[PDB]
Amino acid sequence: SIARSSVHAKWVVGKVIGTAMQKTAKVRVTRLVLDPYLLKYFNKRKTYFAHDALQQCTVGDIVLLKALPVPRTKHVKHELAEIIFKVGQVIDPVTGKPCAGTTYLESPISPE
Amino acid sequence: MARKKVRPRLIAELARRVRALREQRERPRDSQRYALDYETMMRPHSGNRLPMRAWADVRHESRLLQLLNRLPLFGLGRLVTRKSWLWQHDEPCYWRLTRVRPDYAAENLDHGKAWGILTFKGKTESEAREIEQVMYHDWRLVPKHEEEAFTAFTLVPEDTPLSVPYPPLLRAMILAQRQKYGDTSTEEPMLNLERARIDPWDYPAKLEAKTKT
């Protein structure tokens, strides 16, 4: 049972920068880093490559990334696990209904 | 480690390549490697001077390929013994030669690589192994009519103890640990030595590469 990666990023979450190249999305991961003079946490961004086999990335998605055990190349070490929030088509994971920001697109208290 | 400013060195790989090529091309033959000057006891190839405990046996004895080169079929199945086992052990110790390849660079044909079957202390091993210390001036050859005389053995059982008492303070931890867990039995713990058998120093070491298992 040896399927392991040498990177510390086993599972990360990033916003999609662009889909210019074939079958690979450039994603932008945001982490909280403590600036130690101010003792304050700030957003540090980092760029990653993720293989999309089905070409399902529209720019603006939020994407879960899982680490590949043996990398294909020096810059592609991750792949999509799931499209967490499709841009413009966001379903609430609690109620299972599509929503547009604050306003529900369909009312969840109306089954019929 | 890996950085973005690493530069592609080629000369180190090329030098390792040329060095390997040159040692494979100019690998020294055993005759010029192991030829000896008998007055200085100094090696012309390696520059090493012989130890004084081996000084007498150089002039007083001949090596395996010195005694083997005159044999008709170049010594296959023959038994060759060594002055070291003759002087220290009363039991016969001999090698049954399986295959031998001399080197052709020696004008007297006194050097080569040889294999054989090991018999040490009368115990016969079942595998063929490359002979260590062929080049030593300490080998002797048995005669054909004395071959079965040295072959016959009287097997003697060993009287060494199979178990010894522990060292005393370790024995104290054994007693304390069994008293802590409640073992009432006051039997003396015994260190067993069946895996502790140590083959002494004049056994020839295995020069073949061991296969990792």
Binding site: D35, Y37, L38, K40, F42 | -
Partner: protein
């Protein structure tokens, strides 16, 4: 300067010290090229004993001879240190007395 600007600009770090006329070394060995006198600034009037020296680092400098009385001519070797003279602008070196071709001050006899 709010917290975002201080995070962007980092904490303030002190600048490294500018090297002096002796280039960070405490003393320097020099050979005297010339000797002369030099005038002071506004508050006081004199004519102090100074020298133009070629240093061991290759740069040619103006130095001041302290004390009263000296016997220095050209091709003499001296040892200089980084004391500055307050009255004279441009003079940032003092010859230390009692080394090489210069000695201590002579008592009157």
């Amino acid at each position: 300067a709010t917290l975002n600007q201080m995070h962007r600009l980092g904490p303030p770090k002190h600048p490294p010290g500018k090297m002096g006329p002796t280039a960070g070394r405490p003393q320097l060995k020099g050979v005297v090229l010339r000797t002369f006198i030099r005038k002071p600034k506004k508050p006081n009037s004199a004519n102090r004993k100074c020298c133009r020296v070629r240093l061991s680092t290759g740069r040619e400098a103006v130095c001041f001879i302290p004390g009263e009385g000296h016997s220095l001519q050209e091709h003499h070797v001296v040892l200089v240190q980084g004391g500055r003279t307050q009255d004279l602008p441009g003079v940032k070196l003092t010859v230390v007395r009692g080394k090489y071709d210069c000695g201590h001050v002579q008592k009157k006899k």
